[PDB]
Design a protein around this ligand. Structure first.
Ligand code: APR
Ligand code: DAT
Ligand code: ZN
Lengths: 472, 270, 19, 89, 89
């Protein structure tokens, strides 16, 4: 409570230009997004003549944050949920510093990310079933961290409703999942009351979806909340670069096993979407994240599906208009000619990096939950990639034994070689025994790891430490 | 029966511009600017650029007393790709632009030269046995890293006029061996001379490269490898490590395409 | 088995004045 | 599958003797002559083509036993096949 | 002394050895040394011989080696005959 407003800062607009904009339903706006009545404390008055035209970055300076605490809702959920306010230029290093010992969160083991459409979405049954089943299967095992925005809209709300569908019946009870929400301070309905000078921490946020009007209310659905600010009011799509940078930083350098480096497997999955989803995928691909698209979601899945493995050159603008009439139907009105043509750069950028994008067939390929697609993406972008080393190999298998995919284990053997010594498979078979899947230990015995030197005194003590609580 | 019918099903079911994009790098590094979309059908100059509003970031037109694309002294002021073209008053960089004009926050005017050296030392275990590659002889190429950087950088850069040493080979490296390697560094065949796909180029200037490929028959080949290493002492770098730079080296994305063509320097299988 | 053999049968069977 | 000798003989047994060149020997010298490359010298590497050619050109006295796809049983099938090939025919 | 082990090759070799040696009067000819599969042929020999109805020696395994390549030659030479022929391994 004494480390923040000291190491985490905020960015605001230091003067007003009152450009002639009505902000739809409203009474005049600067361009800052706020009004003259509430535009900081001295920023309402003009600071001499800095400039007669608005461009944010040249004049803005830094002031500390004022939004921190833990949100407790009236009746929706009687539990503690932490939230922090972050700036746009804040490095991810200090943010990870905040997560580990300032919030009491352990090191991640999986960093699946979910992005999708907000207030432009539609529902069908078996897609919902697939999404929910994949969510609980990936989140209940290991220490997977699911990263998603902040809002209660569509599949974005359904990820959380699946979270509590699993959490209502849980042996450990309380919170077995760490779901982090990311949103922009500008796009928050009930900001009044979320600001405190030093700290009070009731952080009351009633979910009043009726009075939101134009800014979607924050969900009651994410365990941790990240609320970014850039100086913009009601502008979505601002946190796209920062989210990608943060997830990357928490991807490669949070563990030091082996004495050099450990790269935690990471996948971002997209369902439906629009321009903001396109920007998210583009920034994610530029940073170096494997991405998977679930086909059939609508209006975004097919376009990426039928350009993923196709050559980049033949993808023309004309092809974009032929793809603009079937899966850009309801969003054609908001798309203008100067705005339509931005859909070819980002798609080309994502496609030409074929090592970080895969398509998940809904009907004919991988007819199962999202585990097969996610692990295929991880093995394609982890083992076959020219950048990653040999240390993380031991971690793809530890991830795979949880997903009980032994055909993939057979497949991955043929291209890697553990010529040094087979003894590196003892730690993974320790976890295989607790996961209890016998095909993996059968593979281990047929590979030739001898059980004579495996079970040691400390090894058997650790195995006896992890009996199944269900049995007597 | 149930799984053999499955194994039976599978097999009787059977029985436009691709040009440089890295130059037009979105989210230009070291600059807070975003680009308008310039598709792959919009890479050539003849196509009409409907939304052409390029950035004007220069942290100026310093064209006075400096003849661009001309023969001005021993400055390498000529473009090797034939005559240049001008678009109204502002000339266009051949191949493509990147998003910076003039000189920018760089060292000085002229070209952002590059001069990549390389050193080889035999692998000592007890007498100097060689660990070959899977197919052919993979000679132990080696690179160094900049003292404060996230990437491995060879001791090269913009060639200072009259010196030919880009301020990084003569310093923070071996001592008392400077004159010896300078003669060798100007004796070799190039890997590529021309504009190259990097997100750190300029519209008014570009990179002219000089490269030399040299192999030492012994790790004690005069003072080039043995005495040079014996007289080299940094004592300031926080981290140091030595590895053979195979496909595992995280160099520039610029350098991978250069190596794809420079693999013919030795003819070995990478 | 009984319906997969049926699904198996189908595809290997293959694999003047107009005024 | 035994290692460093089985594959070389396996992929030259029924193949024509003429196309087996010294160059083919060096391409077979890098994958199944890895740990013994140090003791093999140039004057000693080239002796690996005469003996292989001599054994191969007498196809009635050499057979190859597939570990996975042919004769998936103990060595009896391979031994009896060799005996019948070199005894009756 | 230049050999490596993997499980199913060992199983195949052992099974073939006992099946070919236990039936008929097969004579298995092999060198003299305890190294690798060369040692494993013999270890299979006693693996079969430890449990045998006729007991004693049901197999005749002949070893061939060069006198030059013998470690403990001292004590293996006798003028006419004593025949304790002690050879500690
Ligand atoms: N989290 C949100 N909550 C509410 N409205 C939002 C949100 N994100 C964007 N909007 C607004 O919704 C409209 C865009 O809808 P879509 O085209 O479906 O959005 P998409 O392109 O999928 O972007 C959604 C965004 O949310 C997060 O996943 C991430 O930040 C992503 O960019 C615009 O008015 C904006
Ligand atoms: N390949 C490249 N071409 C141009 N600038 C590069 C580059 N790689 C890195 N830079 C940038 C990062 C440094 O902060 C900056 C320093 O430039 P400088 O040394 O002042 O001039 P110059 O780029 O001519 O050598 O160069
Ligand atoms: Zn304002």
């Amino acid at each position: 409570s004494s480390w923040i407003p000291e190491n985490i800062k905020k960015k605001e607009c230091v003067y007003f230009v009152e450009s002639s904009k009505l902000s739809d339903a409203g009474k005049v706006v600067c361009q800052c997004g706020y009004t003259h009545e509430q535009h900081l404390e001295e920023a309402t008055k003009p600071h001499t003549f800095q400039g007669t035209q608005w461009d944010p970055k040249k004049h803005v300076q830094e002031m500390p944050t004022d939004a921190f605490g833990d949100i407790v809702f009236t009746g929706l959920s009687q539990k503690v949920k932490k939230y922090v306010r972050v700036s746009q230029d804040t490095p991810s290093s200090v943010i990870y510093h905040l997560m580990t010992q300032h919030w009491g969160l352990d090191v991640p083991n999986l960093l699946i990310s979910v992005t999708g459409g907000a207030k432009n979405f539609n529902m069908k049954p078996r897609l919902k079933s697939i999404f929910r089943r994949g969510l609980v299967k990936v989140a209940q095992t290991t220490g997977a961290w699911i990263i998603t925005g902040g809002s209660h809209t569509g599949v974005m709300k359904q990820v959380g409703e699946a979270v509590r569908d699993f959490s209502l019946s849980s042996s450990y009870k309380e919170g077995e999942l760490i779901t982090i929400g990311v949103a922009t301070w500008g796009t928050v309905h009930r900001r009044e009351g979320l600001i405190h000078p030093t700290g009070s921490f009731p952080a009351e946020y009633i979910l009043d979806e009726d009075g939101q009007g134009n800014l979607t209310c924050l969900d009651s659905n994410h365990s941790h909340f990240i609320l970014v600010d850039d100086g913009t009011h009601g502008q979505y799509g601002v946190e796209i670069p920062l989210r990608t940078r943060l997830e990357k930083f928490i991807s490669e350098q949070t563990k030091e096993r082996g004495g050099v480096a450990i790269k935690i497997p990471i996948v971002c999955v997209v369902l439906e979407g629009g321009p903001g989803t396109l920007h998210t995928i583009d920034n994610a691909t530029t940073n170096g994240t494997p991405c998977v698209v679930v086909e059939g979601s609508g209006r975004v899945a097919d376009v990426i599906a039928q350009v993923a493995n196709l050559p980049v050159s033949d993808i023309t603008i004309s092809l974009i208009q032929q793809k603009l009439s079937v899966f850009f139907q309801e969003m054609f009105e908001t798309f203008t000619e100067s705005r339509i043509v931005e859909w070819t750069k980002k798609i080309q950028d994502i496609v030409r990096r074929r090592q970080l994008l895969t398509v998940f067939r809904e009907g004919k390929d991988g007819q199962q939950d999202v585990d097969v697609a996610i692990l295929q993406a991880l093995l394609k972008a982890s083992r076959s990639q020219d950048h990653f080393g040999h240390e993380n190999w031991d971690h793809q298998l530890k991830l795979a034994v949880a997903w009980n995919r032994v055909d993939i284990a057979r497949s991955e053997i043929f291209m890697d070689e553990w010529q040094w010594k087979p003894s590196d498979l003892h730690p993974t078979m320790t976890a295989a025994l607790i996961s209890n899947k016998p095909e993996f230990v059968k593979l281990f015995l047929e590979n030739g790891v001898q059980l004579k030197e495996f079970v040691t005194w400390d090894t058997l003590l650790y195995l006896y430490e992890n009996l199944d609580p269900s049995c007597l | 029966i149930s799984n053999k019918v499955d194994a039976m099903v599978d097999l009787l079911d059977l029985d436009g511009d691709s040009y440089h994009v890295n130059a037009r790098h979105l989210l230009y590094p070291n600059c807070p600017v975003t680009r308008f979309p310039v598709p792959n059908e919009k890479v050539p100059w003849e196509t009409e650029f409907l939304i052409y509003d390029p950035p004007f970031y220069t942290a100026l037109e310093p064209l006075s007393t400096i003849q661009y694309n001309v023969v001005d002294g021993l400055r390498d002021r000529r473009s090797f790709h034939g005559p240049y073209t001008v678009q109204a008053g502002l000339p266009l960089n051949p191949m493509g632009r990147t998003g910076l004009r003039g000189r920018g926050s760089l060292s000085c005017f002229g070209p952002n030269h590059t001069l990549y050296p390389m050193v080889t030392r035999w692998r000592r275990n007890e007498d100097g046995a060689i660990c070959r590659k899977s197919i052919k002889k993979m000679l132990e190429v080696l690179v160094v890293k900049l003292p404060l950087s996230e990437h491995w950088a060879l001791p090269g850069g913009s060639r200072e006029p009259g010196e030919m040493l880009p301020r990084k080979l003569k310093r923070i490296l071996r001592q008392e061996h400077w004159p010896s390697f300078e003669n060798l560094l100007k004796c070799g065949m190039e890997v590529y001379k021309g504009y190259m796909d990097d997100p750190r180029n300029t519209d008014n200037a570009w990179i002219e490269t000089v490269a030399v490929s040299v192999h030492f028959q012994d790790q004690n080949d005069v003072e080039l490898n043995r005495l040079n290493s014996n007289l080299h002492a940094c004592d300031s770098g926080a981290s140091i490590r030595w590895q053979v730079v195979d496909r595992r080296i995280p160099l520039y994305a610029n350098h991978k395409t250069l190596l794809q063509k420079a693999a013919a320097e030795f003819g070995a299988h990478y």
